[PDB]
């Protein structure tokens, strides 16, 4: 029934008279009912770790055992919500305590329990056989998440014997009963799940659909595929906010789960104050992104037991939303801080340190957590198909890349988008360093490119070659001088400069350059290559680049004016514009080359 306390030391509490405690399980300790996690067992005693401060505990205080490991509530009412590491609703705590601090031991349900949802019964009906993962209804939540499907929790079977008609229901009402060995199961609108146990799925699949962002330099040279993985450096001058905002505003995804696993405070207040001001543009200036994203935030002074268990909370929600047939995309934030918190937990527990101090777990846990991404087919009746994508952000531990975490994550991920402050400080956005970044999903996207836009791979290979040749020429001009080069070399350098100035660089503060669709980029690459090759042709047949640059005139102008055609004018208009531009360019090269 209850176990008393026996000894207290730091965050370690040892209870007694407790028989029947799982090795990992949540217990309520003290008269304030703090939470803890069983760690050791020997006879009656059971070492417990208390998340919050342990001061004021007295021998003999009762202890309650919950009977399940650290879990998370899943159901309606997740979107437009802000949580702590262990899913504490911060928007409701401030309304309950009416203060600015978090009371020690305050407990409120993770989901609002007094609100009416409109439930529509599914295709199942009494007498039918049902199994885990099946859909048996729907719920209306927003105008953006228009249908929130209801799922029978996995690991549950039997024959349904009672269902409710469509109506107004709250999260404390039973709406289904399943008979397996007695009509003794009652299912409400929500269900829980352990956070360290991957959510079951029918079958994993391969990733073959690109993750469209809007930035040309990423969708063209270093593409990412839905269900993939990524990591990017985290610093101040560079700025990953330019990535996060665009990804959460224009990606082709149906949900975003931002996760902050330990930050500086002020620089968390400056992101909690921005999301409820970003408007997506579909079917009009649709409601802010908050209708579509749930957010997990952890400042630096939250309980350490929570700052390390955050990325497990976000990924579980991402998998839950995948289980409905959506394309989720989690976004971590400074996983290095999570690694530091893990090291702190282990060191306090006490274990032999591995390379540089981190425990041996790091290499295994990183890969295990990263394995949850990827496309999959959910287990259920209507045969959904979803995917989850992770975009990490490795924070150089002290300003380097030799620490174990960076190497471990760089060998696990598949993409890398390097960012340099040198480019950013001199007005170059997005500040991508196109030499150290790379992408490995290139050869898996052919099944899509050839079906839609066959010429991509050759064009991008040629452009990468052009840039490499430009930098090659650049480490020699300063010593040998520009005059010692041919006209082909100068043509290559000039086209490289044109690309670097009016293709890679994007505005992001207008309507013409804020989100470049796929064809809007394919056509630009086509036009740039059509200019470069026809320019090289004139030198090949006999001419002087001095007489080519001047004679061309508007040729080097129309290409740079291509980016000023707003992509909101309709695809057909821009396609016609580009085709006419190519025709005019080749006609002029037919004239100027006479």
């Amino acid at each position: 029934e209850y176990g008393a306390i026996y000894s207290v030391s730091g965050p370690v509490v040892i209870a007694e008279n407790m028989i029947g405690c799982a090795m990992y399980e949540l217990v309520k300790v003290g008269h304030d009912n703090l939470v803890g996690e069983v760690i050791r067992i020997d006879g009656d005693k059971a070492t417990i770790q208390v998340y919050e401060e342990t001061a004021g505990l007295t021998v003999g205080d009762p202890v309650l055992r919950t009977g399940k490991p650290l879990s998370v509530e899943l159901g309606p009412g997740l979107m437009e919500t802000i949580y702590d590491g262990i899913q504490r609703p911060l928007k409701a705590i401030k309304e309950e305590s009416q203060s600015i601090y978090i009371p020690r031991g305050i407990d409120t349900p993770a989901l609002d329990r007094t609100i009416k949802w409109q439930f529509t019964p599914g295709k199942f009906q009494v007498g039918d056989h049902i199994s885990g993962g099946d859909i048996y209804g729907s719920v209306f939540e927003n105008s953006l998440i228009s249908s929130h499907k209801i799922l029978l929790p996995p690991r549950s079977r039997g024959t349904i014997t009672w269902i409710a008609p469509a109506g107004e229901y709250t999260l404390d009402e039973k709406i289904l009963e399943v008979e397996f060995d007695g009509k003794k199961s009652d299912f409400t609108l929500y269900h829980t799940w352990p956070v360290r146990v991957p959510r079951p799925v029918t079958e994993k699949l391969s990733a073959d659909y690109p993750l469209l962002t809007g930035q040309r330099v990423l969708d063209a040279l270093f593409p990412c595929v839905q269900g993939g993985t990524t990591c990017i450096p985290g610093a101040f001058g560079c700025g990953k906010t330019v990535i996060s905002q665009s990804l959460s505003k224009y990606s082709n995804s149906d949900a975003i789960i931002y996760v902050g696993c330990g930050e500086r405070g002020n620089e968390m207040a400056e992101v909690l104050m921005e999301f409820p001001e970003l408007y997506t543009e579909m079917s009009g200036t649709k409601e802010p992104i908050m209708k579509r994203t749930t957010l997990v935030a952890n400042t630096s002074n939250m309980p350490v037991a929570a700052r390390e268990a955050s990325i497990y909370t976000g990924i579980t929600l991402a998998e839950y939303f995948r289980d409905q047939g959506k394309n989720v995309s989690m976004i971590a934030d400074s996983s290095s801080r999570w690694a530091e918190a893990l090291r702190e937990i282990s060191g306090r527990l006490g274990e032999m340190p591995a390379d540089q101090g981190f425990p041996a777990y790091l290499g295994a846990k990183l890969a295990s957590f990263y394995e949850r991404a990827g496309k999959a087919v959910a287990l259920g009746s209507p045969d959904r198909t979803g995917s989850v994508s992770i975009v990490a952000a490795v924070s150089p531990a002290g300003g380097d890349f030799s620490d174990p975490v960076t190497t471990a994550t760089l060998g696990i991920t598949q993409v890398f988008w390097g960012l340099d402050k040198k480019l950013a400080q001199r007005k170059h956005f997005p500040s991508i360093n196109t030499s150290v970044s790379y992408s490995k999903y290139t050869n898996v996207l052919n099944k899509f490119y050839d079906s839609n836009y066959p010429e991509f791979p050759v064009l991008r290979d040629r452009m990468k070659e052009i840039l490499s040749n430009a930098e090659e020429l650049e480490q020699v001009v300063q010593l040998v001088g520009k005059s010692a080069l041919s006209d082909s070399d100068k043509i290559t350098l000039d086209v490289a400069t044109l690309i670097k100035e009016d293709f890679l660089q994007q505005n992001g503060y207008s309507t013409y350059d804020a989100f470049c669709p796929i064809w809007k980029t394919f056509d630009m690459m086509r036009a740039f290559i059509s200019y470069h090759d026809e320019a090289q042709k004139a030198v090949a047949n006999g001419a002087n680049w001095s007489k080519l640059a001047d004679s061309t005139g508007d040729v080097k102008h129309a290409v740079s004016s291509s980016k000023f055609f707003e992509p909101s004018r309709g695809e057909k208009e821009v396609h016609g514009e580009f085709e006419k531009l190519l025709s005019t360019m080749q006609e002029r090269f037919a004239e100027s080359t006479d």
Binding site: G350, M352, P353, Q356
Partner: protein
């Protein structure tokens, strides 16, 4: 002046190339090795105290 300047530039550029290519990396490797050794000793001290 042409001959003298050629000589001086040649010697200085040669010295710069030598320093860049076969001095800095050697010292960097030495620093990395010593850094590893220090942690190697720290681990043993920690283990003794643990025992």
């Amino acid at each position: 002046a042409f001959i003298i300047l050629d000589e001086v530039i040649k010697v200085t550029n040669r010295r710069v190339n030598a320093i860049e290519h076969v001095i800095i990396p050697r010292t960097e490797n030495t620093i990395a090795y010593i850094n590893s050794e220090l942690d190697e000793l720290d681990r043993e001290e920690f283990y003794r105290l643990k025992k």
